[PDB]
Nucleic acid binder design. Structure first.
Ligand SMILES: [Ca+2]
Lengths: 67, 66
DNA sequence: ATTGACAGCTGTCAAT
DNA sequence: ATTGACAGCTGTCAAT
């Protein structure tokens, strides 16, 4: 199988941090992310569905707010 | 988004409804059954899945009144 | 324990 | 009053 390219995942991670208080990209943002990361839309969607569960709280805890 | 025009053919839905009724105690077609139904209904797989997600909420309960 | 993925559900919008 | 669709979530599976 394999994992997603590290630069692709770097971009998604940076976006999630910057928008961590509304971690839901619009259709156009998802489209920009797809093109930037060279991933499909479905891949970008799936990453966000996983990352809102697996990365985001640890981010918002480090911040004071409680998910 | 999700801004269609029209409803699914009556014959396509009669097939889905018949299958749902016959399998009403395990209303989950296998991948092999989803493929057969799609060929029969002339719907895509995704259309079939969506019908079943809706039908299990909208049709199945009233059916299980037996 | 991490990661990518997806079947099926909830909730809702848009269309009859 | 019904329908087709779909975003995002839950739960989970296979691969790391
Ligand atoms: Ca889905």
């Amino acid at each position: 199988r394999g994992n997603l390219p590290k630069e692709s995942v770097q971009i998604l991670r940076d976006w999630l941090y910057e928008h961590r208080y509304n971690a839901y990209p619009s259709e156009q943002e998802k489209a920009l992310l797809s093109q930037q990361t060279h991933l499909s839309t479905l891949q970008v969607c799936n990453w966000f569905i996983n990352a809102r569960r697996r990365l985001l709280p640890d981010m918002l805890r480090k911040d004071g707010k409680d998910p």
